[PDB]
Amino acid sequence: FKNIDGYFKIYSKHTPINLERDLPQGFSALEPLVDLPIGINITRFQTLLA
Amino acid sequence: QSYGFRPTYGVGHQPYRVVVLSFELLHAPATVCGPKKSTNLVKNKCVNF
Numbered sequence: 001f002k003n004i005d006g007y008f009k010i011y012s013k014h015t016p017i018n019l020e021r022d023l024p025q026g027f028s029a030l031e032p033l034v035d036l037p038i039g040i041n042i043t044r045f046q047t048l049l050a
Numbered sequence: 051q052s053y054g055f056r057p058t059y060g061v062g063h064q065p066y067r068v069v070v071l072s073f074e075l076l077h078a079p080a081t082v083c084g085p086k087k088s089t090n091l092v093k094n095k096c097v098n099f
């Protein structure tokens with residue numbers, strides 16, 4: 001997530017793992033998903049769990 | 051107080067529907083822009099695009 005002047009940028013990517021360890025090796029570039037034109041300041045963020 | 055609004059009253063007493071369009075800026079960058087018309091494009095020719 002990025003908080004540029006007037007577009008909250010969002011990037012996403014999905015890759016398999018097939019193993020049980022720390023973050024795997026190799027590069028995986030995330031692609032832009034939505035611009036979300038908003039002018040609201042953002043300094044704190046939280047995670048939504050179910 | 052309530053109006054009469056009968057179809058027999060003159061123009062000075064007839065009801066009118068008014069729509070006001072207020073424009074704002076400096077809040078969000080370019081959220082409501084006007085109609086951007088376009089033209090049919092061609093190829094294999096030197097044309098401005």
Ligand SMILES: *[C@@H]1O[C@H](CO)[C@@H](O)[C@H](O)[C@H]1NC(C)=O
Binds near residue numbers: 041
């Ligand atoms: C948001 O950030 C802008 C740019 O730094 C600043 O001018 C403005 O006062 C900030 N607003 C709030 C509510 O923090």
